[PDB]
Design a protein around this ligand. Structure first.
Ligand code: I7M
Lengths: 116, 116
């Protein structure tokens, strides 16, 4: 069965740092962007919404504006990595990386942000 | 945006009763099974896993074996209803109906089971 795996399910990060949460799914040979959906969420906040090759950044939650991106260079290797720059306390919570790619799976990642 | 809607996000049911949890998604004309993934879970228990029409009884969580199924009579109407027979206390929790169908969405539904 199509499996999403997270190499780390717990991130403990310093205030103001840059953080990359990895999220892996299998790709045989070539990645078919047209078949891929990548969704990143935290307490119902829309962080990343990659739908069949297209990203609507208008729907991203304001609290993540200019700080959260999906690293496309990784995607091609089956890593739907979320990078957050300038991490804030408002970023702490349970993240879910959800993938649809001929099959579907998701995993949780807890991020704890240390006090300044 | 592709939207999964739930006509009810809270069910309050009697112990030992039958329960249908509705979950609706848009269907334009004919249903394309090869494009449909429906998944129902609660507390990481795999309840329904319908992948392009394919289901595997072996992956269904044992506490729901023989009691839970996906209502197929109205998948063509866009209702991926989860039916549970002989509701038990351990059926109380937060359910997710996750649907991929030319796009992807999911909704949470809370079930509270009244004591007998
Ligand atoms: C979780 O185990 C599973 N899971 C499954 O299928 C699951 C996996 C994930 C997903 C998605 C999905 C995928 C990608 C993205 C999204 C998504 O885009 N979400 C989203 C998007 C937007 C919004 C906000 N709203 C926007 C609009 C506007 C207004 C409104 O109301 N909506 C909310 N949410 C979804 C949903 C879609 C169907 C189903 C599913 C399946 C087959 C099997 C399993 C079993 N695993 C076990 C395996 C073996 C061992 C192991 O480690 N793994």
């Amino acid at each position: 069965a199509f499996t999403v795996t997270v190499p780390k399910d717990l991130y403990v990060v310093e205030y103001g740092s840059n953080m990359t949460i990895e999220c892996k799914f299998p790709v045989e040979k070539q990645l078919d962007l047209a078949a891929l959906i990548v969704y990143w969420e935290m307490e119902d906040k829309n962080i990343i919404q990659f739908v069949h090759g297209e990203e609507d950044l208008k729907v991203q939650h304001s609290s993540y504006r200019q700080r959260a991106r999906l690293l496309k260079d990784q995607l091609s290797l089956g890593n739907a990595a979320l990078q957050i720059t300038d991490v804030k306390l408002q970023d702490a919570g349970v993240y879910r990386c959800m993938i649809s790619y001929g099959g579907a799976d998701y995993k949780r990642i807890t991020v704890k942000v240390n006090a300044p």
